[model samples]
Target: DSIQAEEWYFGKITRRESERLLLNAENPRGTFLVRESETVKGAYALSVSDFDNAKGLNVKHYLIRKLDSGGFYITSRTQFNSLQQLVAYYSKHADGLCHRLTTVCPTS
Candidate 1:
C-alpha cells in the first residue's frame, strides 16, 4: 500500500521496460509559442512558426490584422490579461490567414 501510495506522487516506471510508440511522421506543421518579457504592467510575447517550402524555419511574432507585423513592433496598447484572450480575439476578427487558423483555441 505504501509503495502504491509513493507511486501516486512519484513513479519508478516499475523498473520495467517501456516501449515507446513511434510518433507520427507527418506531425502538425506549425507551432505557436508564447513568452514573457518586461513590460510596465507585465505582458507576454508570442511567436508563430512553421516550415517554408525550403524547409527552413518560418517564424513570426504573433500579430493582429496586418499580415507582416504587430506584437513585437508595438507595446500592449490594449488591455489583455493573457495571450489566449488576445489570440482568440484576433483569430476571430483579423484579416486573411490569421482568422482562418480557427475561431478559437482549444478550451482545454
Candidate 2:
C-alpha cells in the first residue's frame, strides 16, 4: 500500500496569530465547519465556518482534490471501508456529536 510503504514524517512550525486556521481537513475527529456542495478533483479539503451547529452533527466543509478529474460521493454509513476503521473514526468524532446516537457503557 502506498500509505504503508511510504515513510511518513512530521514537522512542527509556529504560525502567527493573524494567520489563523480558516480552513482545513476534518481529520478523523470532529469538525465545526460546513462543507461546500461543490468540489474539485477526487481530493478533498475543508473550510472553516460557523454557519450552523444546532443539531450538533459536527458538520464541516470538505473538498476532495481532482486526482483523476472524476469522482462520486455517498452519504451512507455502509460506504466505510472496514468495520474496525469505521469504528475508530466514529469513536474519535463521537464526543462532538450527540450522545443519543451512541451508548457509553462501562466495561464489566
Candidate 3:
C-alpha cells in the first residue's frame, strides 16, 4: 500500500513530507485532519489544539473543512435557548456527537 505523508502545521508551505505529497501551509495555525485510527476507525484527527493558561482550559478546535488557500473560514455549533434546539441537536447526534450537554435535564 502507498501512504503519502503529510503534516498539519501552522505556517507557510515549507516542504513536502516526502516524495509523495503534502497538503498544508505551516502558518496561521488551523486545519482539519481526517485519519483512520485503530479505535476511531476514521475521523477528524487533530484540527486545532490549544491551551489558554489564563483561562485554564485545554481547548481543541477542529477545522471542519479543507484549506485550499489562505482566507477566512467559519463553522457553527448551533445554539438554542429553547426546546427546539435540544430536539434537533438531540436527533442529530443521538450518541451525543452534535454537542455535549450538561448534567441537568432541559425543562423545555
Give TM-scores for every candidate, taking all chains together and pairing residue i with residue i.
0.35, 0.21, 0.22
Stretches > 4 Å off in candidate 3? 1-3, 9-38, 53-108
Local accuracy of candidate 2 as per-residue lDDT tens digits, 5-107: 2111001211211013322222222322212223343233323222244733233443323223333222342334432233344445433333111222111
Query: TM-score for model 1?
Result: 0.35
- lDDT, residue 26, model 2: 28
What lDDT is reached at residue 61 by model 2? Answer: 40
lDDT of each: 0.31, 0.27, 0.26
lDDT of 3 by residue, 1-108 (tens): 111223322222212221012122221222222233223322122222222356422223332222234221223344333222333343344232322222111111
Pick by lDDT: 2 or 3, better one: 2
Q: What clash count goes with each model?
A: 0, 13, 5
lDDT of 2 at 30: 33
Worst 10 residues of 2 by lDDT: 9-18
**What is the alpha-carbon lDDT of model 3 when measured against the actual structure?**
0.26
Query: In model 1, what are the clashing residue pairs, if there are any?
Result: none
**Rank by lDDT, descending?**
1, 2, 3
Ranking by TM-score: 1, 3, 2
